[PDB]
Design an enzyme around this catalytic site. Structure first.
Site, PDB file in Angstrom:
ATOM      1  N   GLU A  87       0.963  -1.612   0.042  1.00 21.50           N
ATOM      2  CA  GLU A  87      -0.414   0.249  -0.183  1.00 21.50           C
ATOM      3  C   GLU A  87       0.850   1.365  -0.441  1.00 21.50           C
ATOM      4  O   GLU A  87       0.403   2.566  -0.044  1.00 21.50           O
ATOM      5  CB  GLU A  87      -1.077  -0.067   0.976  1.00 21.50           C
ATOM      6  N   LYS A 120     -15.769  -1.600   1.695  1.00 24.10           N
ATOM      7  CA  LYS A 120     -14.909  -1.719   0.241  1.00 24.10           C
ATOM      8  C   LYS A 120     -15.750  -2.682  -0.731  1.00 24.10           C
ATOM      9  O   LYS A 120     -17.040  -3.724   0.385  1.00 24.10           O
ATOM     10  CB  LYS A 120     -14.368  -3.265   0.856  1.00 24.10           C
TER      11      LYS A 120
HETATM   12 MG   LIG Z   1      -8.332  -3.905   7.633  1.00 17.60          MG
END
Ligand SMILES: [Mg+2]
Ligand SMILES: [Mg+2]
Ligand SMILES: [Mg+2]
Ligand SMILES: [Mg+2]
Ligand SMILES: [Mg+2]
Lengths: 437, 437
Positions: free
Chosen positions: A211, A345
């Protein structure tokens, strides 16, 4: 209106294939790309992989792509669907699959059509995507709200050497007056941190995890947090930058207890922590550091440990693997008073409509919503428009490094610029960004 | 007809600001994002940086953005230029700046406009960008040629700890039958390498650098190369994967000599190598490993060493630091027979026309052209369309990790699919991609 639906394999930010969908209408061709997590929650909608070890390390998405091309596409084109009606788009997709967890077609076959449809709809309406998404979610649009970015700066846990158990350390420039300023001052903390990290740990600890955060061999949470405070001070932003954690505690949960030394194969079983002991550890951190948010402090089904900690947390507690962007699990979390914020998400549930529902259910219970990337991202910028559309006031979409992260943050800059005086930066009010007036 | 030219600050893949330009015509809004470059140095076009240490570490682009908005834009719109005439667009921009190195307005300001114009032009012609770029370059279009990707897998030199002097180790899947196959087998090699690297060197050695390669602490060229060979074999692609090097030997050039131990501060002068001695090392590597390309084997001004080596090299020799995409340097390199391939960095020269001209001059001399990314990249996919338009057969745009790299590689997948039987993969013919039939 919809004349063609098409899917192909493309590569995510870790170099694994994922599904890209194109939907064609009279307004043109609308592209959506499906992101992918690592060590996905047991309750996530099915990400369909080929499992052919002779192709892509077993990680091909040919079956999911074929499900779009050979199954969804001809039915969808022949269903005469109004793309502006996202609920109808998603009702149709869900009905084809017919399974609770989207295991017949794959969540990664369904989501790309779901998302692309919303892009086609914004174009039909001649509105930018965030305006259309605000329409779908019935969010207030005077003003729109720009999110605090929760920027990953330092990585621990599974993908990291060292004994540092906790997975993500984020900075949140809540003290900034605009999104542009927030991202500038955030980036400056990041560069100071990279500089400090290379000086203290060597040139190689300056390289980044999936990330974009640095991932040095760190021993403890306190060492990581002291390093971050140093970067904030060095950049000159003390008082303006807060801290967020993602503990990802499901990664270190073993039969009822929490192993903070889980990277050590000969870990002392007698030292593993109980729910209440781990919660003590978090309180110690919260006292010494400007921590305003903690995600997955306890494991994905350890309801009692969540409910106990929530009584006295006094800061944002974010459900990720506990809730999996699933209205059914969110209902349970609300009833049990397990948390006060949803990590949203879209690919955990598989449709835009269910995702919007999950946000609406959260907001209705007085929860916040932090829209989230996955650790395997793409050049797709959907979630930047989604976070503005939902008016949440908060997003996590990575470090200010690696362009699968910058694409979203750059898109937010564009949206902020476009909105002008009809947008406000959530700042200190990020938790209830949806109710900000 | 161009009605508006606009610039804003966005972030590159390293979290530093860069210039984004938008050019508006009747066909819509067309966007370019410029990679990062150099703001100082000889021979190359200079981007403009603000140098305000209290903003963005001194790396702001507010001046460059202002030059677009307040200088280039009003004059450009006023001049009513035909965007299809890229030469005229670029002559105009060059004239407004008035300096050889684009230091008045900034190479970043100029390049943004140059590139956005070609996108507007492609739309006016109703063709994909790569087709318009083929028109500008007068390249052969039956078939078009998809490039071999030179994928960064491993970094040393100034880009790592340890003693490894050479900077970049790349894999080139010349043995594939299509671009899609090349990218798949390349990603498999990379994953195997990442896996081996973490097992042999520890979990932190799996963290990625700027371009997505790993940077373990390695001692010798041989050790790095043996590791890459193991990865190729583990993935099952021996015979199909070749190796490219970037020595970046200017980094270890001291006196007239090459210090292969330059990272050691008490490095033993007198163990330093002359040109011919360094050439012996490359020759011994060439005999032991499937190296098909070596970039910057000798220092940026050590013309005699380059020319001497080239006589008997017998593989592709790529000029990067030697030429800096500078037409005068290229002409010299051609005359001196120093090398036989150009690393083409569009932002190092500052306009599309000049980039195309540099490529054409290289091709005319029987050189190859490797279209190149920069360390600080963006989600912009321009160089994918450029390499196809230029018909070069070879692109260097990063590891199959980080989406500033994958954005290009994905765009190449899309371009290949679109072209179908109208395109071939360069494969083993990468060097003379332009002349391939
Ligand atoms: Mg998480
Ligand atoms: Mg099936
Ligand atoms: Mg509205
Ligand atoms: Mg043509
Ligand atoms: Mg080089």
């Amino acid at each position: 209106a919809v004349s063609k639906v098409y899917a192909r394999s493309v590569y995510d930010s870790r170099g694994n294939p994922t599904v890209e969908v194109e939907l064609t209408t009279e307004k043109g061709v609308f592209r959506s790309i499906v992101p992918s997590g690592a060590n996905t929650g047991v309750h996530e909608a099915l990400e369909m992989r080929d499992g052919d070890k002779s192709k892509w390390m077993g990680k091909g998405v040919l079956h999911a792509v074929k499900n779009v091309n050979d199954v969804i596409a001809p039915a969808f084109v022949k269903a005469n669907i109004d793309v502006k009606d996202q609920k109808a788009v998603d009702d149709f997709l869900i009905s084809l699959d017919g399974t609770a967890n989207k295991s017949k077609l794959g969540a990664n076959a369904i989501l790309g059509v779901s998302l692309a449809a919303s892009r086609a709809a914004a174009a039909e309406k001649n509105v930018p995507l965030y305006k259309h998404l605000a329409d779908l979610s019935k969010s207030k649009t005077s003003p729109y709200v720009l999110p605090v970015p929760f920027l990953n700066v330092l990585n621990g846990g599974s993908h990291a050497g060292g004994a540092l158990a906790l997975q993500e350390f984020m900075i949140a420039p809540t003290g900034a007056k605009t999104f542009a300023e927030a991202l500038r001052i955030g980036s400056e903390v990041y560069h100071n941190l990279k500089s400090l990290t290379k000086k203290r740990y060597g040139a190689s600890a300056g390289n980044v995890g999936d990330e974009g955060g640095v991932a040095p061999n760190i021993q403890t949470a306190e060492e990581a947090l002291d390093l971050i405070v140093d970067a904030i001070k060095a950049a000159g932003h003390d008082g303006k930058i807060k801290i967020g954690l993602d503990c990802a505690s499901s990664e270190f949960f073993k039969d009822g207890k929490y192993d903070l030394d889980f990277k050590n194969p000969n870990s002392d079983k007698s030292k593993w922590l109980t729910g209440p002991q781990l919660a003590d550890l978090y309180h110690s951190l919260m006292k010494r550091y400007p921590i305003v948010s903690i995600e997955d402090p306890f494991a994905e089904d350890d309801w009692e440990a969540w409910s106990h900690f929530f009584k006295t947390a006094g800061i944002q507690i974010v459900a990720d693997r506990l809730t999996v962007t699933n209205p059914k699990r969110i209902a349970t979390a609300i009833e049990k008073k397990a948390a006060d914020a949803l990590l949203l998400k879209v690919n955990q549930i598989g449709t835009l409509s269910e995702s919007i529902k999950a946000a609406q259910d959260s907001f209705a219970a007085g929860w916040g919503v932090m829209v989230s990337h996955r650790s395997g991202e793409t050049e797709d910028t959907f979630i930047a428009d989604l976070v503005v559309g939902l008016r949440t006031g908060q997003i996590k979409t990575g470090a200010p490094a690696r362009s699968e992260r910058l694409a979203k943050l750059n898109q937010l800059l564009r949206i902020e610029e476009e909105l002008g005086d009809n947008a406000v930066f959530a700042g200190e009010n990020f938790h209830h960004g949806d109710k900000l007036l």
